[PDB]
Amino acid sequence: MPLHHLTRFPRLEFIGAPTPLEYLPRLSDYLGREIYIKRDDVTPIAMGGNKLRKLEFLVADALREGADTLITAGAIQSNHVRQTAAVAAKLGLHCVALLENPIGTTAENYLTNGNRLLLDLFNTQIEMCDALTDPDAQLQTLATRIEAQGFRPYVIPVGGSSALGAMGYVESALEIAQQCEEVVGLSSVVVASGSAGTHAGLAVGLEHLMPDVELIGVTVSRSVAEQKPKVIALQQAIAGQLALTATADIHLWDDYFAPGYGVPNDAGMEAVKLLASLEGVLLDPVYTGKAMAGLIDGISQKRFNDDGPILFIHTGGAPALFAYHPHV
Amino acid sequence: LTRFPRLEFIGAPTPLEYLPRLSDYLGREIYIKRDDVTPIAMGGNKLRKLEFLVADALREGADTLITAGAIQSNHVRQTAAVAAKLGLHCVALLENPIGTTAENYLTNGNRLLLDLFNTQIEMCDALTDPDAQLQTLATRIEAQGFRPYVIPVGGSSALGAMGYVESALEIAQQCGLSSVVVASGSAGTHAGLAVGLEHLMPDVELIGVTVSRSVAEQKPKVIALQQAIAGQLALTATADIHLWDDYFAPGYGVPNDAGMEAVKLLASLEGVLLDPVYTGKAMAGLIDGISQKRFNDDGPILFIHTGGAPALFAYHPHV
Ligand SMILES: Cc1ncc(COP(=O)(O)O)c(CN)c1O
Ligand SMILES: Cc1ncc(COP(=O)(O)O)c(CN)c1O
Numbered sequence A: 001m002p003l004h005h006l007t008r009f010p011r012l013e014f015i016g017a018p019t020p021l022e023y024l025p026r027l028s029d030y031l032g033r034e035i036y037i038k039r040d041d042v043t044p045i046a047m048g049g050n051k052l053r054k055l056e057f058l059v060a061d062a063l064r065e066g067a068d069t070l071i072t073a074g075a076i077q078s079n080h081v082r083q084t085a086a087v088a089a090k091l092g093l094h095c096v097a098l099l100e101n102p103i104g105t106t107a108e109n110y111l112t113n114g115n116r117l118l119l120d121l122f123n124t125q126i127e128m129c130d131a132l133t134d135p136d137a138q139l140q141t142l143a144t145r146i147e148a149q150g151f152r153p154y155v156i157p158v159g160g161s162s163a164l165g166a167m168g169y170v171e172s173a174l175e176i177a178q179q180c181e182e183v184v185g186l187s188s189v190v191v192a193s194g195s196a197g198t199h200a201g202l203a204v205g206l207e208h209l210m211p212d213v214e215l216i217g218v219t220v221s222r223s224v225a226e227q228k229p230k231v232i233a234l235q236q237a238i239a240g241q242l243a244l245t246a247t248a249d250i251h252l253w254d255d256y257f258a259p260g261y262g263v264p265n266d267a268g269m270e271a272v273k274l275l276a277s278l279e280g281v282l283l284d285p286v287y288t289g290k291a292m293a294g295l296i297d298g299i300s301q302k303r304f305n306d307d308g309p310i311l312f313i314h315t316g317g318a319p320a321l322f323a324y325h326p327h328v
Numbered sequence B: 001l002t003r004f005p006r007l008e009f010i011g012a013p014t015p016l017e018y019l020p021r022l023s024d025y026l027g028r029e030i031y032i033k034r035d036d037v038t039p040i041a042m043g044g045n046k047l048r049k050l051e052f053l054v055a056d057a058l059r060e061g062a063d064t065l066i067t068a069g070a071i072q073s074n075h076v077r078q079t080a081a082v083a084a085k086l087g088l089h090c091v092a093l094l095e096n097p098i099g100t101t102a103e104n105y106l107t108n109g110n111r112l113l114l115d116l117f118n119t120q121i122e123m124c125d126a127l128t129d130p131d132a133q134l135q136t137l138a139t140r141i142e143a144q145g146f147r148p149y150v151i152p153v154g155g156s157s158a159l160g161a162m163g164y165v166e167s168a169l170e171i172a173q174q175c176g177l178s179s180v181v182v183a184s185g186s187a188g189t190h191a192g193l194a195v196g197l198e199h200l201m202p203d204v205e206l207i208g209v210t211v212s213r214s215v216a217e218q219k220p221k222v223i224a225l226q227q228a229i230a231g232q233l234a235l236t237a238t239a240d241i242h243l244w245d246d247y248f249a250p251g252y253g254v255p256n257d258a259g260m261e262a263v264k265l266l267a268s269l270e271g272v273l274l275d276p277v278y279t280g281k282a283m284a285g286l287i288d289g290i291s292q293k294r295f296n297d298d299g300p301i302l303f304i305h306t307g308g309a310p311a312l313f314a315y316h317p318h319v
Helices: A004-008 A025-031 A051-064 A079-091 A108-112 A114-121 A135-147 A163-180 A197-209 A224-241 A266-279 A288-301 A320-324 B020-026 B046-059 B074-086 B103-107 B109-116 B130-143 B158-174 B188-200 B215-232 B257-270 B279-291 B311-315
Strands: A021-023 A035-039 A069-075 A094-100 A125-128 A153-155 A188-193 A214-219 A251-253 A310-314 B016-018 B030-034 B064-070 B089-095 B120-123 B148-150 B179-184 B205-210 B242-244 B301-305
Touching (some): A004 A163, A025 A035, A035 A163, A051 A163, A069 A135, A108 A320, A197 A224, A214 A224, A214 A288, A320 B109, B130 B148, B158 B188, B179 B279
Parallel strands (some): A188 A214, A188 A310, A214 A251, B064 B148, B205 B242
Antiparallel strands (some): A021 A035
């Protein structure tokens, strides 16, 4: 009942059935704690991920406005851009992507393989910049240029993380509550926290459907001081759009991303190896390997509220494995 | 069918989807069976087979899965993922079928994943007699203390092929269809669908586009397997096997221009990722079947996407 104003928003159907929520018995045996995984890495468009859920809402909005072109921004290996570009190709929309190299690599697989390879299969128009210093302004300037050609552009913010885009994670939280019903009593949920739509939308859903579950965001690009106001602002804007209040505190751990967005680290790589080798699950060096390194150290240090089951939200990212290989 | 032990790797039936943009472009209704979206380690058709073969492996108390393929085999990758998930060791007998020294083919895409899954790698100069060579390796590995179970190439035995009989049931539930198109390689996909569709959808024409062999070399292989699957299901199987072999030159594992064009077509019109070895070749055959009015009629076509996209990253920029 409490999430019913979610109905009001038009949304396209990109996902179909709920993604699997799976027990991880071998990882659980190794870590000493019950671990489940929400498989949003298996959403069925072009190698999947979390952004498909936000795109259901943002793209329906674009179509309702008569937009014929999606414009967005991200790193060269952005999964968000790749999902946007894929959904543009499927709907016959034009797509322009503003990309940066956030790590200064000159490695050939980073520059041309992985997600960046897929952009060319989707016929994305690619524009480089030096840095996404002000992505909102930079996307605007691009949109004016593109409007000047007669296109009708719809700007998707970095990660698709607006209140509307985040409604896809509010819906995720409904799936998750239904799938856990009479199957597992979760104590904790772990998700990577980047542009913040996933964390914020899960925060609102979970507050209203599973108030006693502890949600933990593991930052992938910023400290708690810099990330938390972003997540809170979205959380409140999402609640507002749904006529709800959201009084939960947002929780963030920032110890697992150094030395910076897009830079692999040892604990990240060891988490990827652990999940591949124990569960046949593929994480990624930028986002999910770092969030899973967080979950693991949190168990080790007793950082969670209790000893109860933890659900990891697998937000996707695997095609970056092939871009990061052999090194950047 | 419900008689054979099987593990649950897939779950809900995979989507069967209309492709409206590609249908618009080609002037014909095209649908696709998304077996590329199976949920383990980037997906594919082989998981369906592994549900039966691995259930059998555990029944024998095996602790090791052994299989063979090219360095970029999807089948080996999916086998190795299922091993990891189940806590079985995995041994992969690999060959370089194309003589390349390109770094991405040698170490990226499916091969990178084998390393993530702690797969034990054995190189061989050629899979001249895969069944015999797997047999020999199984005996060495046993001699080191393991209990191996051998999975044949493509996991394409009668048992393994039952997973494709299952796919046909899903296809029948999900479906005014005239044709179905599928890559035809190690032949379990083709033969299992052949048996399933003969019974469930007898008016539909099943076309296998070969990826490694001529019609002459492939047809007996598919027929034998068709008959062996039908025997074990206590079914009859009298349908002809239809193969087009024009779409794979110059050989298995070698991309060709029509295949790369089909990959680009599906990506740009529908956001769908094919692959250079299997499904881009099979799609190229589908497209040229339209070009050459080569199907029985002008009616709907279902393409079976059997997977393979991770090889995109191995084959780039070239081999
Ligand atoms: C795999 C993956 N996981 C998580 C994230 C971070 O999600 P969010 O931007 O909603 O914080 C992203 C960002 N595109 C992602 O690609
Ligand atoms: C993506 C892909 N397509 C189709 C095939 C061919 O299927 P089969 O080997 O059962 O003929 C394979 C074989 N491993 C494959 O990996």
